[PDB]
Amino acid sequence: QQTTLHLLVGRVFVHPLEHATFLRLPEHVAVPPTVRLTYHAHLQGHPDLPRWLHYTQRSPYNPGFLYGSPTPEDRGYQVIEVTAYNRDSFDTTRQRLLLLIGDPEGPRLPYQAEFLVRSHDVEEVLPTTPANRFLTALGGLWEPGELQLLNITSALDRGGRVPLPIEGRKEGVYIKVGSATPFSTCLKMVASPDSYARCAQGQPPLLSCYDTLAPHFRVDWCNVSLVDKSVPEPLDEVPTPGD
Amino acid sequence: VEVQSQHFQINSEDGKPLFSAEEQDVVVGTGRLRVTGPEGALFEHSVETPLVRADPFQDLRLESPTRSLSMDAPRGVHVKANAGKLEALSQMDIILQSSEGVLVLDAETVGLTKLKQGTQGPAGSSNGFYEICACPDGKLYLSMAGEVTTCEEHSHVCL
Amino acid sequence: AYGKRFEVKTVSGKLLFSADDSEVVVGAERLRVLGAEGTVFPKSIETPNVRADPFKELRLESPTRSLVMEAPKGVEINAEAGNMEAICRSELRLESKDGEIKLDAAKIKLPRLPRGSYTPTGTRQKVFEVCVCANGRLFLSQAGTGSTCQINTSVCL
Amino acid sequence: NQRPELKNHIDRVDAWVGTYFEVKIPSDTFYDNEDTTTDKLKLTLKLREQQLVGEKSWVQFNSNSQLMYGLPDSSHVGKHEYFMHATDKGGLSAVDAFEIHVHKRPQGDKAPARFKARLAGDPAPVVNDIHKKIALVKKLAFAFGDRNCSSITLQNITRGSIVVEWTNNTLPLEPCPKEQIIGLSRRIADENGKPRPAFSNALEPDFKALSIAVTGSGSCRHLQFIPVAPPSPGSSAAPAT
Amino acid sequence: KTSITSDIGMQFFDPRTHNILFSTDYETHEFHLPSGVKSLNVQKASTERITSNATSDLNIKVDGRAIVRGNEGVFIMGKTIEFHMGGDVELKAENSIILNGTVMVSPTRLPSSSSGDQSGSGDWVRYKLCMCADGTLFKVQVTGHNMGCQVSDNPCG
Ligand SMILES: *[C@@H]1O[C@H](CO)[C@@H](O)[C@H](O[C@@H]2O[C@H](CO)[C@@H](O)[C@H](O[C@@H]3O[C@H](CO)[C@@H](O)[C@H](O)[C@@H]3O)[C@H]2NC(C)=O)[C@H]1NC(C)=O
Ligand SMILES: *[C@@H]1O[C@H](CO)[C@@H](O[C@@H]2O[C@H](CO)[C@@H](O)[C@H](O[C@@H]3O[C@H](CO)[C@@H](O)[C@H](O)[C@@H]3O)[C@H]2NC(C)=O)[C@H](O)[C@H]1NC(C)=O
Ligand SMILES: *[C@@H]1O[C@H](CO)[C@@H](O[C@@H]2O[C@H](CO)[C@@H](O[C@@H]3O[C@H](CO)[C@@H](O)[C@H](O)[C@@H]3O)[C@H](O)[C@H]2NC(C)=O)[C@H](O)[C@H]1NC(C)=O
Ligand SMILES: *[C@@H]1O[C@H](CO)[C@@H](O[C@@H]2O[C@H](CO)[C@@H](O[C@@H]3O[C@H](CO)[C@@H](O)[C@H](O)[C@@H]3O)[C@H](O)[C@H]2NC(C)=O)[C@H](O)[C@H]1NC(C)=O
Ligand SMILES: *[C@@H]1O[C@H](CO)[C@@H](O[C@@H]2O[C@H](CO)[C@@H](O[C@@H]3O[C@H](CO)[C@@H](O)[C@H](O)[C@@H]3O)[C@H](O)[C@H]2NC(C)=O)[C@H](O)[C@H]1NC(C)=O
Ligand SMILES: *[C@@H]1O[C@H](CO)[C@@H](O[C@@H]2O[C@H](CO)[C@@H](O)[C@H](O)[C@H]2NC(C)=O)[C@H](O)[C@H]1NC(C)=O
Ligand SMILES: *[C@@H]1O[C@H](CO)[C@@H](O)[C@H](O)[C@H]1NC(C)=O
Ligand SMILES: *[C@@H]1O[C@H](CO)[C@@H](O)[C@H](O)[C@H]1NC(C)=O
Ligand SMILES: [Ca+2]
């Protein structure tokens, strides 16, 4: 029933929920695609998940997903209970997960870039292979350096709009990538006010260096947030208990 | 009236705690709270209780102002009223479904308000029409339409 | 403080706080709960009105049990702009011990009745057929033998 | 033709008492398989069940341009619900239920500036006609030179003669900025209260303008702005203990 | 009793940190829910979803009427949906009622004709039900004997 997982503060953690684990079907057989499941995870002893966790699922046929980046104040031991609820036989099953929020290892990541991928949805990015493909595609522009995901969030949580299904329009996702090596000239130029001025009236964003994410990743280029975490925030004042 | 101390407490006459405010967090020991404000409580995410009552107001009103209300229970949904009545209204449709089971209509009298009329003419095509029969089990079944009665001809279905 | 009842009131007289033995009355015009994972009330709630926020949908769900609703004076269900769907799996029972069932929709469909099968001799049980009186009240009559849905005495209007 | 889908919800329209409020229906609220946009559908507003909204109601829906406009009354504080029906050429209708909040302004009684304009005639037709009130507010905004009607916040209409009092929502709450108040006074009338010719031209031909006055409120409640004021006496509360 | 009368009310703050732990000036200091409450009695609960425990029912007990209003539809799911109505059951739609699935009816309570009650000579107005291909129901007048569902016109559109 229970399972133990390891998590690092300020990093993306994804644990897909699949019919095979909950329905406990035989390994040598495959679960029929006609089955339907609607999981609902919640904190133990409480009716919903904490702030830093998120649950998403497209259709009952598709597998569910738990994601989110733990916050430093949420370090320790946590228990998450998942209640799978079949929609055909109307019978439920329960499972537990144990999460141990560790601590980040190695040097800090002080250079962060927030993108906006309009060619993918939060369901198609959570699995490991698309995320790795995106990381390798972005590695060319940020070379030298290694990129590790820091935050993934659906656009609908950021005041987005449901897209009209005309040809291929999708909600889009926000991906935050952190690294320790300083940005190249291309990323600095993209974040320059000239691009903002250009797309203010409708001119295409300035892009001199060769793109690599295309055509598999249509990215809104003049909306890319650059954050430098060098010179960290000063210590906040604290009150000493009086006599 | 300003009370400046480290631990404020209100007890019963015997000594059972009734209320306590300190640096840690406020605690209500009587096991009941009551807010008399007209705006009422404003929750954030969810509420987990095993019983919802309507005090002496004698009227409960569940409402979803701009989206669809929905109930759910895997073991079944029960609605009870010893001396009341059910009035289901809808401006679009009323769909009752059962994937595998039956639809029992237990009532001494059942009335159908709206039902049009059709002239009985042999010239029309027999196909595309059916006649409803009810065998002593209680279930209903269909028979191919015809100029004469045919319920007894296809009475094998509920054997 | 000890005693039987502790209260706070304004000069005109208005209970801003009162912690008696039974309950703790608070005069706040609006209580706000800011929990992120929800709140748990072991015993119950007592409200005359439940109203979802104007961006979400109410959902009275029980995760692994049945939902029982009691209302002695009657139940009314309204869906002003949508179907009043009711999906089950085992049995959908509409009971009325000493009343009636009325269906006032503009049309009625029953598109899953078990289709019959042809039998030359058939069976001998009297398969009743359904016939409607003048005022819309249904009744059952014996299978095709002599008379028709007639033979009803005076039970319908 | 499959019935139109409700791609995006509205579910909330905010409004404050007195100020003119208007909302344009977004271009992706509805979507049909053929028309493919809400502007090609037929939008209508309904109160409840299927009954229509009366022409005397404080909320009106201009369907051809797909706009909703209104001026909530002083006694309509609270929450209301409505329905938006989208009908295509095939007769299929999609309904979206939304809710309108009418709330009192945060500066309801702390407004630094309170105005007053006197108009000859009767106030009975004006009070019970939303279109006339909208026209009056728009004419006032045009007279002041500001094309945005959302600034003016009407408060009261009296009997006998049409005496209308309002505030300027743009004006800061604290402290009272006297200089633009006196500039508006110069642009609107003279020192003795006789209206500026531009004001008379703008207000006409709806009503007849005779005189206006501007008093103080908020922090500087002891000041009158029309240049006939004896401004020196204020609170005048200086006792001796 | 132990009464306090004032224009504002009692206020308690810890001298060590000088933070108001509990004030009765609700407008300036909002009220936070104190831990340990088993039941709550509020005038209006603007929640978003009500759930029972992982192993308990959700009982809804009232004494008067219960009014349910979903402004965009009311959806009910489960295994066995029951309506133990003590009076009348009135489904009043406006476009159609779709009685999907197998339909049954109690024969022991419905008025069933008996054999040997041909006393009524007068042929009162009566109808026999009929099931169109698409699903719509329509009644046909009964005149003679041994007649079924043959109709020249098209009643079900
Ligand atoms: C993020 O970046 C993408 C593409 O790079 C933009 O589509 C998106 O919104 C757009 O933002 C730019 C400026 O950042 C703006 O020029 C675009 O049009 C404006 O829209 C505002 C909306 O109020 C108008 O007032 C203004 O006159 C322009 O027309 C805007 N696109 C749209 C469709 O609104 C960017 N989002 C954010 C939050 O920056
Ligand atoms: C409520 O008060 C504000 C004051 O902040 C008014 O805004 C000003 O309105 C006037 C006329 O409506 C405008 O002319 C002001 O714009 C400025 O005007 C000067 C000339 O006076 C120009 O030289 C400037 O270039 C600028 O255009 C405007 N002030 C600002 C900062 O926008 C507002 O109108 C008033 N409400 C109403 C209903 O009149
Ligand atoms: C990863 O992205 C998510 C996207 O939602 C971030 O969650 C958001 O975090 C901010 C910062 O806390 C929240 O804003 C404010 O949070 C405070 C609590 O500190 C709260 O009191 C305020 O009311 C306000 O909510 C924001 O709400 C939250 N988003 C959601 C949907 O809850 C998250 O912080 C990001 N994490 C990292 C490491 O980048
Ligand atoms: C989930 O919530 C349900 C709420 O019903 C919990 O079950 C209830 O637990 C309480 C314990 O405080 C039981 O009260 C006890 O009842 C017995 C017998 O009546 C009585 O002798 C005791 O003095 C006490 O009052 C209550 O009966 C019980 N109800 C049901 C229906 O089981 C349950 O424990 C909760 N589970 C978790 C994991 O939180
Ligand atoms: C009355 O109940 C029956 C039983 O569910 C409904 O039949 C169901 O109708 C839907 C839609 O027509 C079918 O879904 C379709 O299934 C096919 C595969 O067969 C798939 O290719 C389509 O994309 C679509 O998903 C469903 O299979 C069918 N169920 C059965 C058991 O036949 C019927 O629609 C209900 N009547 C009304 C008026 O709603
Ligand atoms: C008229 O008023 C409306 C709202 O009161 C203005 O729309 C927004 O106004 C706020 C603050 O006034 C700005 O921050 C937004 O950028 C405005 N939205 C836009 C411009 O799309 C509107 O700009 C006003 N128009 C005039 C001519 O004053
Ligand atoms: C904390 O200690 C410092 C000593 O430097 C003192 O000045 C300060 O007042 C203390 N904090 C509080 C809240 O009293
Ligand atoms: C001004 O409005 C208030 C609102 O309470 C009303 O009582 C008063 O009669 C109004 N005065 C005039 C002159 O219209
Ligand atoms: Ca809605």
UniProtKB/Swiss-Prot annotation, chain A:
Record topology, Extracellular segments: 1-243
GO biological process: membrane organization
Tissues with expression: Striated muscle, both skeletal and cardiac.
Tagged with keyword Phosphoprotein: yes
Membrane topology category: Single-pass type I membrane protein
GO cellular component: cell-cell junction; cytoplasm; cytoskeleton; dystroglycan complex; membrane raft; plasma membrane; sarcoglycan complex; sarcolemma
Name this protein carries in UniProt: Alpha-sarcoglycan
Subcellular location: Cell membrane, Sarcolemma; Cytoplasm, Cytoskeleton
Native source organism of the sequence: Mus musculus (Mouse)
Portion of the parent chain present: 24 to 266 of 387
Alphabetical keyword list: Cell membrane, Cytoplasm, Cytoskeleton, Glycoprotein, Membrane, Phosphoprotein, Signal, Transmembrane, Transmembrane helix
Curated annotation (Swiss-Prot), chain C:
Source superkingdom: Eukaryota
Assigned keywords, A-Z: Cell membrane, Cytoplasm, Cytoskeleton, Disulfide bond, Glycoprotein, Membrane, Signal-anchor, Transmembrane, Transmembrane helix
Membrane topology: Single-pass type II membrane protein
Record note on modification: Disulfide bonds are present.
GO BP of this protein: calcium ion homeostasis; calcium-mediated signaling; cardiac muscle cell contraction; cardiac muscle cell development; cardiac muscle contraction; coronary vasculature morphogenesis; heart process; membrane organization
Disulfide bonds: C131-C156, C133-C149
Expressed in which tissues: Most strongly expressed in skeletal and heart muscle. Also detected in proliferating myoblasts.
GO cellular component: cytoskeleton; dystroglycan complex; plasma membrane; sarcoglycan complex; sarcolemma; sarcoplasmic reticulum
Keyword hit for Transmembrane: yes
Broad class of the protein's primary localization: membrane
Sugar-bearing residue positions: N152
Record's function text: Component of the sarcoglycan complex, a subcomplex of the dystrophin-glycoprotein complex which forms a link between the F-actin cytoskeleton and the extracellular matrix.
Protein name per its UniProtKB record: Delta-sarcoglycan
Species the sequence originates in: Mus musculus
Lineage: Eukaryota, Metazoa, Chordata, Craniata, Vertebrata
Portion of the parent chain present: 133 to 289 of 289
Curated annotation (Swiss-Prot), chain D:
Residues of the site described as Cleavage: G160, S161, H222, L223
Role, per record: The dystroglycan complex is involved in a number of processes including laminin and basement membrane assembly, sarcolemmal stability, cell survival, peripheral nerve myelination, nodal structure, cell migration, and epithelial polarization.
Tissue-specificity statement: Detected in brain and kidney (at protein level). Detected in sciatic nerve (at protein level). Expressed in neurons and muscle cells (at protein level). Expressed in a variety of tissues. In brain, expressed in the hippocampal formation, the olfactory bulb, the cerebellum and the thalamus. In the peripheral nerve system, expressed in Schwann cells.
Disulfide bonds: C176-C220
Extracellular side: 161-241
Ranges where the Peptidase S72 domain occurs: 110-219
Modified how: Autolytic cleavage produces the alpha and beta subunits. In cutaneous cells, as well as in certain pathological conditions, shedding of beta-dystroglycan can occur releasing a peptide of about 30 kDa. SRC-mediated phosphorylation of the PPXY motif of the beta subunit recruits SH2 domain-containing proteins, but inhibits binding to WWW domain-containing proteins, DMD and UTRN. This phosphorylation also inhibits nuclear entry.
Section of the entire sequence shown: 492 to 732 of 893
Residues of this chain annotated as glycosylated in UniProt: N148, N156, N168
Name of the encoding gene: Dag1
Domain of life assignment: Eukaryota
Annotated organism of origin: Mus musculus
This protein's name: Dystroglycan 1
Curated annotation (Swiss-Prot), chain E:
Post-translational modification, as annotated: Disulfide bonds are present.
Tissues with expression: Most strongly expressed in skeletal and heart muscle. Also detected in proliferating myoblasts.
Subcellular localization: Cell membrane, Sarcolemma; Cytoplasm, Cytoskeleton
Topology Extracellular: residue spans: 1-157
Record: glycosylation sites: N53, N100
Record-annotated disulphide pairs: C130-C156, C132-C149
Oligomeric form and interacting partners: Cross-link to form 2 major subcomplexes: one consisting of SGCB, SGCD and SGCG and the other consisting of SGCB and SGCD. The association between SGCB and SGCG is particularly strong while SGCA is loosely associated with the other sarcoglycans.
UniProt family annotation: Belongs to the sarcoglycan beta/delta/gamma/zeta family.
Name of this chain's protein: Beta-sarcoglycan
Source organism of this protein record: Mus musculus (Mouse)
Lineage: Eukaryota, Metazoa, Chordata, Craniata, Vertebrata
